[PDB]
Paper text:
The [name].1.5 variant of [name]-[name]-2 has rapidly achieved global dominance and exhibits a high growth advantage over previous variants. Preliminary reports suggest that the success of [name].1.5 stems from mutations within its spike glycoprotein, causing immune evasion and enhanced receptor binding. In late 2022, a recombination occurred between Omicron sub-lineages BA.2.75 and BA.2.10.1 resulting in a new variant [name].1 and its further sub-lineage [name].1.5, the latter of which rapidly became the most dominantly sequenced lineage in the United States. We find that while the [name].1.5 maintains a high binding affinity for human [name] as similar to previous variants, it has a diminished affinity for mouse [name], representing a departure from earlier [name]-[name]-2 variants.
Focused-refinement of the [name].1.5 [name] bound to mACE2 was possible, allowing for detailed analysis of interactions at this binding interface. Figure 3D shows that the positioning of mACE2, relative to the [name], is preserved between BA.2 and [name].1.5 RBDs, suggesting that large structural changes do not rationalize the binding affinity differences, rather a dissection of interactions at the binding interface may provide mechanistic insights. Indeed, differential side-chain interactions are observed at amino acid position 493 between the BA.2 and [name].1.5 RBDs. While Q493 may have been expected to gain an interaction with mACE2 residue Q34, this residue is found in a rotamer facing away from Q493 and therefore beyond typical interaction distance (>4 Å). mACE2–[name] interactions at the N501Y and Y505H mutated sites are near identical between BA.2 and [name].1.5, suggesting preserved affinity at this site. In sum, our functional and structural data suggest that the loss of interactions caused by the R493Q revertant mutation lessens [name].1.5 spike–mACE2 binding affinity, yet the binding affinity is not abolished due to preserved favourable contributions from the conserved N501Y and Y505H mutations. While the [name].1.5 variant contains the N501Y and Y505H mutations, it does not harbour the Q493R mutation, and as such, we hypothesized that the absence of this mutation may impact its ability to engage mACE2 and could represent a departure from the omicron lineages with regards to mACE2 binding. As expected, this assay recapitulated the previously reported enhanced mACE2 binding by BA.2 spike as compared to WT, while demonstrating substantially decreased - though not abolished - mACE2 binding by the [name].1.5 spike.
Numbering used by the authors:
A (entry chain D): 20 to 612
B (entry chain A): 330 to 530
The structure:
């Protein structure tokens, strides 16, 4: 029978897969933590063998027909294995698409904009232009950096995107999808028992529904940021207009976290930084990860493995080998869980350690699942379950519990307000940008946006959704979205929006589980084994079950809900309502200075 | 009388090479004195579960035959070497009866059985037509025919080679590291019991 043949095929597959995937992951670790040419070529052959084996098994797995498979775990495993991906096209189209992707990657990584009248002061984006976007206050220098990178990237990436859209559309229609947007929305598709069914076309309307009620909080935050920036820039920002695109603290306006010095509520109250306390008590990276482990065992999740302490790098090695500075949690397979993080003794690295150990705990929990189901429930779950740990670790209760913050510390309302505003600039401000960018990409891939009216549509929606106006008029020879890293390198962007919603949903569920009676932003889940079990029920599943079932296992709901997000930012929302009485909340679509 | 002719336990729990679980090694032990104290002090043991006899009384008991079965499995499967259990190892590699009288001893063997390139010399049977009977071994390498078409000996679609490799590596997690297992099975028959412990005065 076909189902028994599929069961034996998966049993035959898991043993060979786990081994080749471990070889590939170990070679990738040995390259990422000892950058050289020989470790790169070893990584290349390991990934080549693993990819060749995966495509060879995928071709045999496509012979099975899913209409006569009844057990949903085998059906989900065969669904995961039968995703050919980019291999569905012919060799010529696949090679052309790979050429376009590689040239986009190597032209984004080598992007170059240079100072007019000062030809020696030529700046790349990664070391120097991001510093200008983050720190500089000069209007003309930001206008230069923004417009120059827009010109020397959009003009060069417009035709590349023109055939990139067509090739990705061909690949998606070769994989039985309507467009490439539906191919990306297929990551949220859940096929399961009645009531847990999620469809790709549903996701758009769910995102719009969850954006229908974040909009008042975003509008009040936008009005406050606009007034403070008007204080900073006297005549270049209008009270009733949109914000200029180059005054948002980032290159693209993705995160508003760099506007915190300009938009601080209470400048006299300092932040809750505890870096100097770590310096005074002689903390090191080992103590940071040990405190993170103490947090995860206090909540009920398992301890870290001995191989985690033995094999991971938690410090810059400083013995002559080059490493990648980015923190990454690695699930190499066969019970090997590592963290690559160049941990300095700071507060940010402490929260980052909690985040990455949250990733490792998520990876450790679903190790009992079969090989093809050792992933997150969707693309948003994996980062949300680390962000919740970062949220709980940063509270003044947790910092007073572990000795970092003095025992006689008084939590006044002003530090809560400015902490919540910093959290909003990081978290709330990225949501209209994320939604507008994914909506634009979906409508471009769908063909709803005409080919010759791309730019004119985008700057309308940034005026409408994000409330951010262009500084200079752009015609259709520009490709202004393509200046972003995620879109020039073929990455889905809606995962950050879903991450943001799932994060506060998980946090409210765990705080109700822990019987916390206060404001949600002050909640700590330390010493609450029942909350850890409530979490671990979802963590143990992986993608074995539909993500709606895992979401119901944590929060008791089967869809995205932003009532926890608004409940988290409720003191800040009340404060922003209190200081927007005289001003105008909202923006006008026409270009106001 | 003087204590001599001790049973060769130093050759079972300390061999330079153990066997795959599919072709598990069996040594019969008879006509000697059973000094189980050497077994006790031979390594730190992950499990010394004894099914049917108590760990202490052993020396003062006298059995007719003692079978020492030695093999290497992965740590996660050590729970399967017990009566009444199921899995790949219990069903297709090594089965203990439900009335098993004896002990199962397992210890970690990373320093001896793990290689960084991968130890591909420890094999296990993943596919078998029927489950194994207690104390049975199958050494057959016949291609497992999982479908309806005959395999014809050559590996191919729906035809899988039954012996898979335990690719042991030193950086694996504790549940996947190689564990050496010795199963002591004590049997009494109508014959005079000739395996008893030491006597003192
Ligand atoms: C979660 O549970 C642990 C253990 O129950 C809590 O740690 C405990 O924290 C209290 C207050 O910080 C400690 O009490 C004081 O400790 C100092 C230093 O030893 C001592 O001089 C004082 O006289 C008093 O005993 C307690 O010792 C400590 N226990 C342990 C085992 O660390 C932790 O605070 C809890 N966290 C939360 C958020 O509830
Ligand atoms: C970093 O990588 C280099 C090579 O990629 C390692 O150097 C090798 O070390 C092994 C074991 O001593 C030798 O057999 C090789 O011949 C060495 N190759 C070279 C080119 O030197 C080095 O040991 C690695 N460092 C760490 C800390 O793992
Ligand atoms: C047991 O194994 C160790 C490891 O090599 C060896 O040194 C020792 O001689 C062995 N003892 C016996 C009695 O075989």
């Amino acid at each position: 029978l076909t189902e028994e043949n599929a069961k034996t095929f998966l049993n035959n597959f898991n043993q060979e897969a786990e081994d080749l995937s471990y070889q590939s992951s170990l070679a990738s670790w040995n390259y990422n933590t000892n950058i050289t040419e020989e470790n790169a070529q070893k990584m290349s052959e390991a990934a080549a063998k693993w990819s060749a084996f995966y495509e060879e098994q995928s071709k045999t797995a496509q012979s099975f027909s899913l209409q006569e498979i009844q057990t949903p775990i085998i059906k989900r495993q065969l669904q995961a294995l039968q995703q050919s991906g980019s291999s569905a096209l012919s060799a010529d189209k696949n090679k052309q698409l790979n050429t376009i992707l590689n040239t986009m990657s190597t032209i984004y990584s080598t992007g170059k904009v240079c100072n007019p009248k000062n030809p020696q002061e030529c700046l790349l984006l990664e070391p120097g232009l991001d510093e200008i976007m983050a720190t500089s206050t000069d209007y003309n220098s930001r206008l230069w950096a923004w417009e120059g990178w827009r010109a020397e990237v959009g003009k060069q990436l417009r035709p590349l995107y023109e055939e990139y859209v067509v090739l990705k559309n061909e690949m998606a229609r070769a994989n039985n999808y309507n467009d490439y947007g539906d191919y990306w929305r297929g990551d949220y598709e859940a096929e399961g028992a009645d009531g847990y069914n999620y469809n790709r076309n549903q996701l758009i309307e769910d995102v719009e529904r969850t954006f229908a009620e974040i909009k008042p909080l975003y509008e009040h935050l936008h009005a406050y940021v606009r007034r403070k920036l008007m204080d900073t820039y006297p005549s270049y920002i209008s009270p009733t207009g949109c914000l200029p695109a180059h005054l948002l603290g980032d290159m693209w306006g993705r995160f508003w976290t760099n506007l915190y010095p300009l938009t601080v509520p209470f400048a006299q109250k300092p932040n809750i930084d505890v870096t100097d306390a770590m310096m005074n008590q002689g903390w090191d990276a080992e103590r940071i990860f040990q405190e993170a482990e103490k947090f995860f065992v206090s909540v009920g999740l398992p301890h870290m493995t001995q191989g985690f302490w033995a094999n991971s790098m938690l410090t810059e090695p400083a013995d002559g080998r080059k490493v990648v500075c980015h923190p990454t949690a690695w699930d190499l397979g066969h019970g090997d869980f590592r963290i690559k993080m160049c941990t300095k003794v700071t507060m940010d690295n402490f929260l980052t350690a909690h985040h990455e150990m949250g990733h490792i705990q998520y990876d450790m929990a679903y190790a009992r699942q079969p090989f093809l189901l050792r992933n997150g429930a969707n693309e948003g779950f994996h980062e949300a379950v680390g962000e919740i740990m970062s949220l709980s670790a940063a509270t003044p209760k947790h910092l007073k519990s572990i000795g970092l913050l003095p025992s006689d510390f008084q939590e006044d309302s002003e530090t809560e307000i400015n902490f919540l505003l910093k959290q909003a600039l990081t978290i709330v401000g990225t949501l209209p940008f994320t939604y507008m960018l994914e909506k634009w990409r979906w409508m471009v891939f769908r063909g709803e946006i005409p080919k010759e009216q791309w730019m004119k549509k985008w700057w309308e929606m940034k005026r409408e959704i994000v409330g951010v106006v262009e500084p200079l008029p752009h015609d259709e020879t520009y490709c202004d979205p393509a200046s972003l890293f995620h879109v020039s390198n073929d990455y889905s962007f809606i995962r950050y929006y879903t991450r943001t919603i799932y994060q506060f949903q998980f946090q409210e569920a765990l705080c109700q589980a822990a019987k916390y009676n206060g404001s949600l932003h002050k909640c700590d889940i330390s010493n609450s084994t029942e909350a850890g079990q409530k979490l671990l029920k979802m963590l143990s599943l992986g993608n074995s079950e539909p993500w709606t079932k895992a979401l119901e296992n944590v929060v008791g709901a089967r869809n995205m809900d932003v009532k926890p997000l608004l409940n988290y930012f409720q003191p800040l929302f009340d404060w922003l309502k209190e200081q927007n009485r005289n001003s105008f909340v909202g923006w006008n679509t026409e270009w106001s200075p | 009388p003087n204590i001599t002719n001790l049973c060769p336990f130093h050759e079972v729990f300390n061999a330079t090479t153990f066997a795959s679980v599919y072709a598990w090694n069996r040594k019969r032990i008879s006509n000697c004195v059973a000094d189980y104290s050497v077994i006790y002090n031979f390594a730190p043991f992950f499990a010394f579960k004894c099914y049917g006899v108590s760990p202490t009384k052993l020396n003062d008991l006298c059995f007719t035959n003692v079978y020492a079965d030695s093999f290497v499995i992965r740590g996660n499967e050590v729970s399967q070497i017990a009566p009444g259990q199921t899995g790949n190892i219990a069903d297709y590699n090594y089965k203990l009866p439900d009335d098993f009288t004896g002990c199962v001893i397992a210890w970690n063997s990373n320093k001896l059985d793990s290689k960084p390139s991968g130890n591909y010399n420890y094999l296990y049977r993943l596919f078998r037509k029927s489950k194994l009977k207690p104390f049975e071994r199958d050494i057959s390498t016949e291609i497992y025919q999982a479908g309806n078409k005959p395999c014809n000996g050559v590996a191919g679609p729906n035809c899988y080679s039954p012996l898979q490799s335990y690719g042991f590596r030193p950086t694996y997690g504790v549940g996947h590291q190689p564990y050496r297992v010795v199963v002591l099975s004590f049997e009494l028959l109508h014959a005079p019991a000739t395996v008893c412990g030491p006597k003192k005065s």
